Amino acid sequence: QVQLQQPGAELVKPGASVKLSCKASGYTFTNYWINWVKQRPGQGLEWIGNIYPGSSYTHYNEKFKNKATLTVDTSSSTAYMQLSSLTSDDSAVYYCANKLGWFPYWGQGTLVTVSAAKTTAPSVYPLAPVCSSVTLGCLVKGYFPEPVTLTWNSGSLSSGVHTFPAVLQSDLYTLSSSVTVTSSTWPSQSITCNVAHPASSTKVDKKIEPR
Amino acid sequence: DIVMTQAAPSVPVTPGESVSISCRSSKSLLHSNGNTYLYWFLQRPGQSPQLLIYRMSNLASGVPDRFSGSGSGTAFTLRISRVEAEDVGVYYCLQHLEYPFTFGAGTKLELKRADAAPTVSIFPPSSEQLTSGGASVVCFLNNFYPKDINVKWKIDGSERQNGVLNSWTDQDSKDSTYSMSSTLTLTKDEYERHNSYTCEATHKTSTSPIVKSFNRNE
Ligand SMILES: O=C(O)CCCC(=O)N[C@H](Cc1ccccc1)P(=O)(O)OCC(=O)NCCc1ccccc1
């Protein structure tokens, strides 16, 4: 499988630099270009620059020439982008992408949050119905920074799911998700919320129990 | 630099209709080698861009043939036949003829589906959260259309406004509806001081609100 692996997130202090990694597998890392793309929440894509791993030849978008430095480690098949003196304008999702012949493959992207605040793990709460179909929920409250990844029954249950975008309020994020199944199905068959928060290396599971 | 212009910030179509997305370049993308260096990608919320078209008119493997790309040397079109829920997202063109590589600003596809009233569900604070010291009451307003909707919370019959946190999803990838989650956060003492909790949803599909409620000590 051709794949590019990127960390889900990086919390960086204002003014400090950050070095993003992009680990490649599934093809010969040295023979293809690694490109880097920036995307602010809700905005469009921007090309930052690229590098040829076998030789480290690089091209930069003038706009990012004084901000980014691209390198690679052929011995670990990893590409890196170091960004200097971050400010709030650097908060964004940064993707790495390669090009094999005509085909580009993208990493899942790293969400860089420039902040002086400390990383805070979420409190995950199961939402069972008040003491046809039934709707269950999961509340992921008070974390920072973005993002969190939420699934149900480890990704097995995906139909009838609504995962709401995280909303920032009082300097902490809150996100929630609901899932609707046939009532005869629950609680006989368990339903569990799996929440992962990259920045705090935490991954929790909350089984929804009847009240 | 080559300027890639996508004239339409957004385009609305109702499910089933065909649609065309335009992108223009400030200079011909047709190389002397005969290839036209233009890509079209679809990006869905929270996903990395996905390849649709390469070489201006080649359909990428795995992409439904409802999609196609054509163009002159500077005017390009991405055509989507029989638009459906999974096609909603932002479409981007990209030229890779010359450095620096440049993207179009993107065109958002919006699906104007049929109106639908929200299905509401209310949830009291979890025992875990209460033990923890706080109390959040959640209401989900699901699968409704259009996007505009309002929620009012009432504690013991009186409207409560501070402590509310609302969030709308993007159009559902399967039925193109929207859903919204509203969370009322109180202190545990506050929560334990009242009994009747209600969330009322008003959507244009009706003048009377869809409401759900519960009594704490029942
Ligand atoms: O100097 C020149 O004539 C060409 C300069 C651009 C270039 O080398 N493009 C290459 C194709 C090409 C070949 C011959 C003539 C024109 C274009 P190329 O697209 O392989 O460039 C290497 C590269 O890194 N491309 C990345 C494109 C890409 C960027 C970000 C996301 C997805 C795709």
Instruction: State the Rg of chain B over Cα.
Output: 24
Domain end residue (candidates: A83, A116, A149): A116
Q: Residue B94 has which token pair?
A: 């990209």
Domain end residue (candidates: A64, A92, A116): A116
Q: Greatest CA separation found in chain A?
A: 65
| H or E element in which residue A106 lies | strand A103-106
Q: Which residues pair with A4 in a beta bridge?
A: A24
**Which conformational region is residue B80 in: left (phi greater than 0), alpha (psi within -120 to 50 degrees), or beta?**
beta
Please give the method by which this entry was determined: X-ray
d(CA A122, CA A195): 9
Task: Count structural domains, chain A.
Answer: 2
B60·A103 Cβ contact <8 A: yes
The DSSP secondary structure of A117-147, one letter per residue, reads SPPBPPEEEEEPPP--EEEEEEEEEEEBSS-
Q: How far apart, in Å, are the Cα atoms of A136 and each of A23, A114, A204, B36, B116?
A: 37, 34, 17, 50, 21
B108: nearest CA in chain A? A44
Q: Residue B216 has which token pair?
A: 């704490």
Residue A174 phi, psi dihedral angles, 5° rounding: -135, 140
Q: Are A109 and A121 in contact (CB under 8 A)?
A: no
**B6 Cα–ligand 1 center, Å:** 21
Q: How far apart, in Å, are the Cα atoms of B113 and each of A77, B54, B80, B178?
A: 46, 30, 17, 11
Which residue, chain included where needed, has tokens 């409620």? B213
Domain end residue (candidates: A101, A116, A131): A116
**B50 Cα–ligand 1 center, Å:** 18
Q: Which of A5, A9, A4, A6 is nearest to A197 (CA)?
A: A9
A44·B103 Cβ contact <8 A: yes
- The enclosing domain of A45 has a CATH number of 2.60.40.10
Which residue, chain included where needed, has tokens 């030789």? A55
B136·A103 Cβ contact <8 A: no
Domain B114-216, classified CATH 3.40.50.150, yes or no: no
CATH code of the domain occupying B1-113:
2.60.40.10
Nearest to A130 among B105, B124, B170 (CB): B124
Q: Which of A143, A14, A165, A21 is nearest to A90 (CA)?
A: A14
CA distance A106 to chain B (A): 7
List, in sequence order, the alpha helices (H) in chain B. Answer: 127-132, 188-192
Q: Are residues A123 and A199 in the same domain?
A: yes
d(CA A122, CA A99): 37
Residue B132 phi, psi dihedral angles, 5° rounding: -65, -20
Those residues whose C-beta lies under 8 Å from the C-beta of residue B210, and which sit 6 or more positions away, are B117, B118, B119, B120, B141, B200, B201, B203
d(CA B35, CA A47): 21
Domain ranges, residue A79: 2-116
d(CA B215, CA B196): 5
Residue B8 exposed, middle or buried by CB count within 10 Å (0-12, 13-18, 19+): middle
Domain regions of chain B by residue span: 1-113, 114-216
Q: Residue A170 has which token pair?
A: 């009082």
Q: Are residues A75 and A163 in the same domain?
A: no
